């Protein structure tokens, strides 16, 4: 029964991660749609956020002045450009919080403090899940916010998915892993259900299925006290049918796939960064 | 009133036990299992539940209402020769085993009385977290209260469809051993978030949510998971760079084979 | 046909290749322009090019000032590394009327508003992506616009190229992806047909009927795609059923990397047009 | 001609297909056409049912209304088919079965047990008969009227490329023009995410993508010129294309769709068996 | 030309394809026939070899059965699977005089003899395997001869063959070895002078200019080893100097497994072959 009474929530952009958290935390219950605002227009996420009943404008001094806790919901190039825009409507009572992948804190607040000292900054990388409840988001605090601003911070993103406090050279690393990883997963779903159709399963039954299957796997994990080999181990039968696919996975190189991919999307990050 | 008997007492025995108790579909001691080896861990973790235990399959047939029989494929027809005599009107033989046809059971069983009343299914482990992927197909002499009651049954602990017999295969190379992929793709997901920094325990805990969560988000979206893949990757940004590189791997290609491999070996198992 | 007609527009190119020839066929095809009204120049007054635009009734001449004289829209029609020696040639030739359209891959804006600039300040530029297939009508063009491009400049030319294809403005950043993706995309396209038929022949088919399907396959799915709300991938598992022949070809696709062939390619093509920029 | 009544046994994407390129080429009306199916809980049934088709669950219906009665289901339910509704063929009927793979001898053997000389022609067609641009190809069957076969080919040209083929041809063609589309649409996809790698907005990408395709469909369609000789013809000497080219053979990617080709042909000629 | 003249032949095709047009086309370049000696005849009268087949002067058909009468030596320039159908239809039109040369790719001898034996005894065959390049005389044929025919008539093909290319006879077992090699070899070719041209392209030679050098670089090389006694692989040691450009690519050619893949094509012809030869 967590509830923010004194808490207005400003999103400067209004996209897909925009749409994501508004829902979530709507849902959730911790946020009414009436206490967030978002800026951005004729856009299909901007057309939802209306339904949900979140406040809209095309203008971000209004989400400024709207907001206590103001995300900044934008691609990482839009970022400076914001921050010069706005930054002379920042006022004590706001934490910034950045959502774009790769970009400092130290760079925030060097644009913000030209405006005033001691913006209260928190980075952060979730991703698009937290639509239905179930991202997984870590932060790091700036230099100047509050101890009670990290631990606002988390209660609110904990109502979404996971939640926990980093430090921040580790963020990077983080959207390689779980800020990129539903794409991941939704990619090896639909080779999942093109593998269930050449077998001769329906497509609508093997998207279902392969989802399941997947859910119920990374739930299994998560409540396990047991390393995923051995939940591998335990799952799998001597000659037995998983063992067979599980050769020719190894023999692709599979996992040497998926560690390429971490890597490839914590080195873009830091490139962006740069 | 309904009792639950289950032939064979491993990992599927335990992960549905699990999750009929923990679902409140019927109480651990209305549940009774028999092996062949009582030193199994699986039937020490029974015990501990609260599952009646037996060496005695006869035991396990006249205790139970829905029988499932849980054992190896190639044990199957020496359990159905073993306990084709006890089975009573009242029972519905639930077959587990991989590759095993409704035809085979039907054909040893109706040796000792007509018309057994035979399902077959193909389940996963996660049902021990009531998030199973269950298929079933009724046999013969399966009345419709059958098909009912073994969806409300399996429904408890995951999803649950009726399904033609010979999609059966197929769903075990998807669902059956798709849990088994996922747990691959974790670990090595968690060592490319250590190579890049990350504490394990960490790396394990995001690639686990990340896939919770996409699977969570396209089961509850009516989106093609391409679309889904389209709407998350930015341009120019992180995401399509790494869906680049497992496209430069043949990584689609690699979960098609690893389907079409465990649907060609459960068709050599029958 | 198109309903419209710039009754008072002369169009010049400068360079008489398969651009020009493209863009002419599809502008008078289109009925927004008489071949009359525009002229072509080139310094190979011989190029098979140049003998069907003759045909057409497209004005000719071998000196590019007087194509410029001529023209209000002047099409650069040359290679990226030529842009530079006509810039020079006909710079001062350019009058307040100019509308500057440079064709050539990779060239910036700021570039030539530079070289043009050292003649007369302010020419207006616009910088445009196109392909050839515009010569049926079926073009994919891009534009975006300079620093002294009045309003109506880009939107006149938005509405004399969109008579011969797709046509949209982008930011001049973007230029380098589309010539990528749309510029070279007819050219991966032609090496999928060919190679699409040398299949159908290695099954069989008489090399005529194979060129004919593959091509007629390859319009289709495209038009289907572009009349759809639908994703591709949705298009590909509707057309697949289960078990059956599409679903093995597309397994074989996979196994070769073939999307990965197809995205290196994009990029391949973007780097190289960036590397012609510099 | 006017009279003419359209059945499909098979209620799935191509019978939405070509319902829906035949009504809007005007060939006649939604409710002149019905379409059977065991499973009334598909999506391309609530489709064909929002279209104005007629629905039913029983083939016999669908034989009894249709005067031309196209076969859209999967080869392996023929058998089961003809031996189901055999005895409800007419002599007005014209068979037209759009299965993979499935022969006309083995469909006039199965009908010939329940009435003389049954009026067979075999076709293979696509998804973009959606979109009248279709690529379909038909052979006769032994008692097929010279009639039939232009009945059929004005029919399926109302929607697309049409021509006659000998029958020994069309396991090839469904492995080109047939399992085509999908290639495309792989392809398209993935150029898409190259678009967006490079910095271009999915939707653009996507528009570009298929428009580049349409556009070398088309211009090839309408040249006389080789496919090579075009792709000489956009490639300029050190230019963008020529280096994306090389790319692509590095890859292989013309023995990719040669082996497409050649797997979607050899699995079509399993369905048979 | 060639200072043969068969002033007493009469040549007949069944089959007006591109082998027909191309051997016609050889003769009569030789010198060696008139082109109004030799008839063609063809199921499609419409082909564009018919067409040029006219302008040549050879007499034209419908019906193969006035090929066989008019002609002494009758070359079967037909598909495979079209040999059986034709040899049934001429069967019984087949003379004392008639020298049959079958062309199709792994017909044999024994089959052919088998199906004209039911209709005459001792028909005289022989088996030729040749390639397009007889239309610029420097095709490479190789022929085995029958069961009946004379010694004179092998004699006599070699001396026709060899008016447009290299001939020699061969064991008719060796022929499926020799369609993979020089019945195939001009596809191979042709597809790596298309790739050359497309190497001399993207470093920046013109089209054109590409394509005549490549052609003009693979025709030198191989005259140098036919009129060698070196081995291929010493000249291959004799132009690379060290350290130098041509061993750099060579070794981009080696890392690629070059020379397995024309062994591997080589062997896929062949075995293709003895496929249509069962
Ligand atoms: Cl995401
Ligand atoms: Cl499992
Ligand atoms: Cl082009
Ligand atoms: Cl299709
Ligand atoms: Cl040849």
Redesign the interface.
């Given at each position: 029964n967590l509830y923010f009474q004194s808490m207005s929530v400003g999103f400067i952009g209004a996209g897909?991660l925009a749409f994501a958290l508004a829902k979530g935390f709507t849902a959730a219950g911790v946020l009414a749609a009436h206490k967030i605002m978002a800026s951005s227009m004729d856009l299909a996420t901007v057309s939802a956020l209306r339904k949900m009943g979140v406040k809209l404008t095309p203008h971000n001094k209004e989400t400024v002045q709207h907001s206590d806790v103001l995300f900044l919901a934008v691609?990482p190039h839009i970022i400076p450009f914001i921050l010069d825009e706005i930054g002379a409507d920042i006022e004590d009572r706001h934490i910034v919080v950045s959502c774009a992948?790769?970009v400092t804190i130290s760079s925030i607040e060097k644009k913000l403090s030209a405006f005033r000292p001691a913006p209260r900054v928190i980075r952060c990388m979730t991703?698009?899940?937290?639509?239905?409840r179930?991202?997984?988001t870590?932060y790091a605090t700036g230099t100047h916010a509050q101890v009670e601003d990290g631990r606002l911070m988390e209660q609110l993103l904990s109502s979404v998915?996971?939640c926990?406090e980093?430090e921040e050279?580790?963020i990077?690393?983080?959207?390689?892993?779980?800020?990129?990883?539903?794409?991941?997963?939704?990619?090896?779903?639909?080779?999942?259900?093109?593998?269930?159709?050449?077998?001769?399963?329906?497509?609508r039954?093997?998207?279902?299925?392969?989802?399941?299957?997947?859910?119920?796997?990374?739930?299994?994990?998560?409540?396990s006290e047991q390393?995923?080999?051995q939940?591998?181990d335990?799952?799998?039968?001597p000659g037995?049918?998983?063992i067979?696919?599980?050769?020719?996975?190894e023999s692709?190189?599979?996992?040497?796939?998926?560690?390429?991919?971490?890597?490839?999307?914590?080195?873009?990050?830091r490139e962006?960064q740069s």
């Open positions: 897909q691609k992948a790769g991703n698009t899940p937290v639509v239905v179930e991202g997984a870590v998915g996971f926990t980093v050279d580790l990077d690393a983080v959207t390689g892993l779980s800020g990129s990883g539903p794409a991941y997963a939704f990619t090896a779903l639909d080779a999942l259900a093109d593998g269930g159709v050449k077998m001769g399963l329906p497509r039954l093997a998207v279902r299925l392969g989802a399941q299957a997947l859910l119920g796997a990374a739930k299994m994990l998560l409540h390393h995923p080999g939940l591998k335990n799952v799998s039968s037995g049918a998983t067979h696919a599980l050769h020719v996975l692709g190189g599979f996992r040497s796939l998926l560690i390429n991919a971490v890597e490839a999307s914590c080195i873009r990050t962006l």
